[PDB]
Design a protein around this ligand. Sequence first.
Ligand code: 5EV
Length: 311
Amino acid sequence: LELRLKSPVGAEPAVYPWPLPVYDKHHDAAHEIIETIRWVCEEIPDLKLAMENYVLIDYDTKSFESMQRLCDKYNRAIDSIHQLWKGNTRPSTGLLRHILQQVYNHSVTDPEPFSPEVYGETSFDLVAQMIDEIKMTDDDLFVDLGSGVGQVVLQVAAATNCKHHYGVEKADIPAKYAETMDREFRKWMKWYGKKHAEYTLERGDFLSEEWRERIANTSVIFVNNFAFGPEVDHQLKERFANMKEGGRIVSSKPFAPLNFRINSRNLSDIGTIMRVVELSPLKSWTGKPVSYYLHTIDRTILENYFSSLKN
Ligand SMILES: CNc1ccnc(Nc2ccc3cc(C)n(-c4ccccc4Oc4ccccc4)c3c2)n1
């Protein structure tokens, strides 16, 4: 009828119905259960000692009795550790990738580059590099513009100490799935006993009047602008022009040339008020040769040009 996994921190058990749900072609619920057990064993060294070696080696994902025996063995090992303990940190990057996968599989049940379906395999590591590079503190406010199902926001919230993390998505289908992703993330994080910063996944148009002041007051913007049209790009540069000095924008395509040279003919260009650098994990990376672009609000670019003319 069903499979149960006791939480290492005494939260409510994870309940899986049998037959287990079928995920996408290269993910399955049975291996999710097994990997969940292996991750909890890493978190708790005593759990490995309490558990008999054969349990995680010899199993049959296609047998209810076999899958039930595995869950029973883990649950009894958890109970022994809970007895031993009688007598809340940020998740590790490896655990976080697994949590995000689990959160996705439990949220998206119904049927092109960097698809949410393959986030863990093609996006996670690049996002993890960007988090390591773009140093964020408790004074920062993070916003992912066009956040989709909310994976980037969840990864950043589980990794940094920003005051708040926001995801804004306009499309009906991703924004609705993000509601489930949000609930599933909070639930699974509690189950493992892991800490995450505050975040909000919301439906809205980042080009709206409400969002103008919100963009102006954001210190760190992430924006996958790869598929943006020239009008969306033009309107976004106008929003960025209201940001504070030192405000940062991390994007998949640059908003200004990397080599911008201020002159009399290009004074209205966004390049007059922002520094732009191309960052790459390749500069021990072994994934895709993909770059990200860091823009920093700096009005001294414009100031020095005027001072140069007057002096
Ligand atoms: C990828 N999907 C989502 C979903 C929701 N939210 C965001 N946010 C977000 C914001 C800023 C950037 C900068 C980079 C490099 N990535 C990026 C990261 C991982 C993989 C690819 C990336 O970018 C692309 C995308 C397409 C083509 C080429 C590169 C960004 C992602 N991304």
